[PDB]
Amino acid sequence: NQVWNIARKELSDGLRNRWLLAISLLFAVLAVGIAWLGAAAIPATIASLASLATFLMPLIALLLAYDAIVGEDEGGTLMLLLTYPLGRGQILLGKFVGHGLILALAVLIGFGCAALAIALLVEGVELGMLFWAFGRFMISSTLLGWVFLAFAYVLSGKVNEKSSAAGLALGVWFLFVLVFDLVLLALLVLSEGKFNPELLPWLLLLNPTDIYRLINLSLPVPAAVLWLCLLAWIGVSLLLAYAIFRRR
Amino acid sequence: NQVWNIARKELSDGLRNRWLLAISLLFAVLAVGIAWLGAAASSIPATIASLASLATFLMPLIALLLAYDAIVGEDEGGTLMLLLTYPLGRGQILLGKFVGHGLILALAVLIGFGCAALAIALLVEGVELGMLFWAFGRFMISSTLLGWVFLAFAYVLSGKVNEKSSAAGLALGVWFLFVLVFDLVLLALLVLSEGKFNPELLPWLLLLNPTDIYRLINLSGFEGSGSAMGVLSLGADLPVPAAVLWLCLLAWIGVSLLLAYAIFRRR
Amino acid sequence: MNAVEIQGVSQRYGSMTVLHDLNLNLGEGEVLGLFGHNGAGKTTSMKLILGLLSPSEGQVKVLGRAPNDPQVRRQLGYLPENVTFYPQLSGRETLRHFARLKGAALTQVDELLEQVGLAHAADRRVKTYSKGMRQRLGLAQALLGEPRLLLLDEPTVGLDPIATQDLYLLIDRLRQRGTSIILCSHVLPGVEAHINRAAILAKGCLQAVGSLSQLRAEAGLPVRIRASGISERDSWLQRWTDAGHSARGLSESSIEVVAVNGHKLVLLRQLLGEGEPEDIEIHQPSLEDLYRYYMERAG
Amino acid sequence: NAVEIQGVSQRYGSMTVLHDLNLNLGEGEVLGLFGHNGAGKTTSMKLILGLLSPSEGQVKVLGRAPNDPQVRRQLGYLPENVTFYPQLSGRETLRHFARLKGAALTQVDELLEQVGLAHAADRRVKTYSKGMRQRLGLAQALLGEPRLLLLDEPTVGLDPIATQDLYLLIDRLRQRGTSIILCSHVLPGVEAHINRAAILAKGCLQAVGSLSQLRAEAGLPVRIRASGISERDSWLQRWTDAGHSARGLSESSIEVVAVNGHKLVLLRQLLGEGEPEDIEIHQPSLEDLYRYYMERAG
Amino acid sequence: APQSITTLPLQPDGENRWRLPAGEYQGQFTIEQPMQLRCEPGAVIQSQGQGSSLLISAPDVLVEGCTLYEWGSDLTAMDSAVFILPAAERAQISNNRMRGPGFGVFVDGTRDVQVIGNEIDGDAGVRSQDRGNGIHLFAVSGARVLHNHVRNARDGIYIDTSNGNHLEGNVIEDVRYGVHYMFANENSLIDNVTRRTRTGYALMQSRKLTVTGNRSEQDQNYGILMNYITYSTITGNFVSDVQRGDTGGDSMISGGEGKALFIYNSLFNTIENNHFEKSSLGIHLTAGSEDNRISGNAFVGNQQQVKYVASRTQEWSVDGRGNYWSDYLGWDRNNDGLGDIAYEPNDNVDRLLWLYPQVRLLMNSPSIEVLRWVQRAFPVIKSPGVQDSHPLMKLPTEKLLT
Ligand SMILES: [Mg+2]
């Protein structure tokens, strides 16, 4: 299968990215430095780790894949790759497998050393609950990163130059992390006569960074809808990315 | 003169950067918004510490967006090797870039703090126009100097590096270190030691950070409380007057420009 | 069993018909050279051989099939212009990666690395390659597997003439094996020794297709009869004015005649017998002035 | 006598990347450097431009210092690949180099029509092609009456109509007294317009002088190509006698490498008696001269 | 309803001093003569479940050593265990055991009455709405009530309009309210311990009183509730681990998330040297209760230190000395006890959470983490809060944990 033959490239090209390894080291140090100041000084410190991975795992995913489609078009390899025995689906889904296993390893260096810094600095942490509360944490941090991978494939296929792809990847990172929730707070403190505040626990479902925190803070909806809505953010935006990639 | 002939290019090339004009209008729409919220709440020492913190986050950002590709952006662009075969020196195509990018920062903060002054004299009725002109004149001729430090910082990290994609990593590293990491390293040194590391050395580490010398100049007379300053409350333990704080800001230019020229001389 | 049978295509985008009634027919072993502008004359037809586009009012037939069948592109090399590969990857690793996609054997990557001459620079990063070093890398993926049709879009840009003449030696090895290739070049002099049939096309239509003898017979261009030391310049200037040929007054005892090449057989008979000469050179009209004439023939 | 490099043994990193080249260049000659893209060609290219110091040897560009600011007004250098200033215009880029080189600002309008870039002037350089930037890169090179051009691959990525028009611009400059150095790699075609070549390899300058000087210093097999012949396979058996490696590329695409003692009488073996159609006698060209001189360096 | 003289008291001394022997008794009893009656420890004076068991109408009676059991439950007709009339001035009720479903010690109109050292176990089955008061005091001046033990009554030591009286060293466990105060101007209470109570100290509309050294261990939803107290004094109180809950009746208070101190419309009072430990709210300051001396306390372990839903500034440091805060990330350069930077306990996003509880879903967002940093960088958007210049660096209440 050629979905893996182009995925082994993106592991080998992604692990030699100097920009990723700087941030993934800074992600792994800050995941220890939050866990150091949450144990010596478990839901109180796993929530501060959720605010860290809402900052950096969208940023790690957008650093990997902002030049996935348009970076190959400027490099000229994209027009070459379509003349190979390869569909446009297998290039995109193979990049999603290749970039997906990178940040599925960046949480194993990120939270694999953070959960070690909790199991050896609490002295009585009751590790049967730890490896399930971090199992729900490492899985849901990959799924948050896989959304922004599919968000990066949407903005790469639309633009025609690599410089304007980073101008949209910065715009998607600003909008989906800390502009969508600031206009949720602005709909509260500035509008009260026509804004029902009961609607706002449902309005977090239009934001994959918000659905990421709700399954680390455990709510009118149950947990199982939020897992099926986080996977739905992957499946619509990957289908949206394939529809954009078929119009180059 | 050749120093102005290449300054006229960068004055006409930086102003066509659409990324520049976004975050220099962002500096303008925030300096009006802070001074209007400072007028609606009254809070005089809080509108100085908010404007000096606004130019701490943005005037290094406008300076490093301008000049990170000043040397390596011409080297990888091919036009630096061409420029040395013109009647120029390496000291004239650097000082010319410093004059050319420096007049943009002298104009990007004259729009920002210019509309900040007109959103007080046309908003606060009966304000003292003499105290307004002096305090916001001190904001104009010192946010250029903070901008000219990070302009001269960007020439250091452009002549040393050899790729523009990797130059943006160092310019982001310098912006993170001097603005909001050195303020946190000094905070964590004071919190974890509870102020008992050194009762006499610790105010002198503010002079090793030009964003903190910038904050100490504008918060000279407008001290007021202590929690409106933060880690800038160590400035009361500094025995140096305000005029030396100007001279340590010019010395941050001249050491990091002579370092910027000695690096570029062996490019 | 023709490799490329372009049968009456009309390619268009909006109101602009960017390719008007092109009809190519590439043989099973020919080396065909597409020459034209950088714009949509050449680069749309080159994209039409590949499955990147579709014939808007015609059809193309690569190897007797449609160009988007996956069995075609398992035996269809391609090297594009100005390609920079993945710079964090390696030289051997990139060709190992492209061998996995084309269905080629992994044992074939070691011969192809040294055939193009990249064994000194394999297992090094692609960012520390030259422009000419990347062109040998991009050639080596076009020979992956056993290709039956190549498309070498500008293979000689930024190459030393040792490696350029080495490249055409690889071409003449390839076309004798039974692999008809396609050149899409701008640099014309040097390529005419190995082009089996030129295919100069301007912006609108297909201008001229034929062999090099087939173009110069049709497109009437002057041959270059340049001599030196016959007896003297003016002592044999008389024969060209009497037979009606434009003759030039060259340097010293030396005769340049830009003849009309109809009499150039019988112009060379009585010239050669009495002629001493030290150093002559008879130049036929090249690919360049043929391209210069066919550009002015269509605008 | 513009460029007079004498006795330069240029080293950096204790490598000795250029050794004892004595490259004199006249007042109207069009030189061509034809080394590789290693440290052979570009070190001598950096040395003439004055941005390098010649270790153990003098360099006299225009009879003066190579880095002196009075001679740099009389130079014009076209670099290899130059994306100049992608947010600047076409005119304002060329106006900027006019103020640097001290040329007249009225020259800037008449250079954008001398070089064919009047249709795309006052547009952004990011909206320019690779060939259009070479037209811009030539336009700054002809600025302020340059007595010494220096063109580093001047016609790569260029249309052949514009390539043929560029050399007619070059031949205009030879008559005016401006020496041109072509640091090129596009060697088929450039030998019709240079005056003296200079092939250098492994640091050492191998050969120098004109084309007739190079053929006198190096016996090459003269190439006799012929297509469209009444005979098909006879020449690959008849013409293998006197060291003639007769080779074809079709049924009749026979090239013949005579040993240049038969340069007048093998044509008498073909056109004296015999019926061909497309007769093509070349001399020893640039490339086979370049091929012979590179292998001599090993 | 018999009298105390209708029993069999063996007189030890002929100066109106009596001694009741061991043995049970029955019915209500009434003291009409100044008899200093003592009792043996086996004197289980068990009533049948109706009426006030030991009514006292004579002055200067040293009731000592009784063991009372099962009196009435009519709280409207005030079925107490020890009823003390207004004419029974300076009564001493020393070291007694009581078990019954009504009022324990109901006094009214008395002066200099002494209720010392008793153990009053209220009930086990009633729903903490009809158990009756432990030590009810109704407009008494002089009431020296010291070191008693009230358990499982209704609203503990209820006090209504009693002017001058001390409450020293008494332990009150598993009751509805610990100490209830109603219009008790110029009062005092020292060193009391309240455990597992739906409100530790009810201070309603009582002025000029001294609340000193008292302890509140694991009470529910209100540590010290002060309603409308003026010119008071809160020095040395230890309020620990006020967990959430509900009072079950919602009569005078509401349910709370757990507040160690709740200041409601108290204008002037000195709140010094206290210790508010491990609650959900360290101190709740309403908008009507402003400008009072709050300096020297220890706000350690609280999940939220101050709740102050206002925009008026509130300095919390008299004479330049402030409070110790556990989450105060400050330094001390010049080696005094005080910190160097002031401490704002509340952000602007920490008061949006009180106004809108839906922001708790957004409380882990990076934008809130941005907005917490934007306030620390830009003090123009900082609403004027409840800061204190010079907060303490070390714990001042090193003795209150003992
Ligand atoms: Mg202090």
Side-chain angles (χ1 to χ4, degrees), chain E residues 332 334 336 338-340:
Chain E
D332 174 52
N334 43 356
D336 58 359
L338 308 169
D340 284 340

Coordinates of all heavy atoms in Angstrom, one line a residue, chain E residues 332 334 336 338-340, ligand 1:
Chain E
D332 N 10.9 39.3 49.5 CA 11.2 40.2 50.5 C 12.7 40.6 50.5 O 13.5 39.8 50.9 CB 10.8 39.7 51.9 CG 11.3 40.6 53.0 OD1 10.9 41.7 53.0 OD2 12.0 40.1 53.9
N334 N 14.3 43.9 51.5 CA 14.7 44.5 52.8 C 14.0 43.6 53.8 O 12.8 43.5 53.9 CB 14.2 45.9 52.9 CG 12.7 46.1 52.4 OD1 12.1 45.1 51.8 ND2 12.2 47.2 52.5
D336 N 12.3 42.8 56.4 CA 11.2 42.9 57.4 C 10.3 41.8 57.2 O 10.5 40.9 56.4 CB 10.6 44.3 57.2 CG 10.0 44.5 55.7 OD1 10.1 43.7 54.9 OD2 9.4 45.5 55.4
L338 N 7.3 42.0 56.1 CA 6.3 42.3 55.1 C 6.9 42.0 53.7 O 8.1 42.0 53.5 CB 6.0 43.8 55.1 CG 5.6 44.3 56.5 CD1 5.6 45.8 56.6 CD2 4.3 43.7 56.9
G339 N 6.0 41.7 52.8 CA 6.4 41.5 51.4 C 6.7 42.8 50.7 O 6.4 43.9 51.3
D340 N 7.2 42.7 49.5 CA 7.6 43.9 48.9 C 6.6 44.4 47.8 O 6.4 45.6 47.7 CB 9.0 43.7 48.2 CG 10.2 43.7 49.2 OD1 10.0 44.2 50.3 OD2 11.2 43.2 48.8
Ligands
MG1 MG 10.3 44.0 52.7

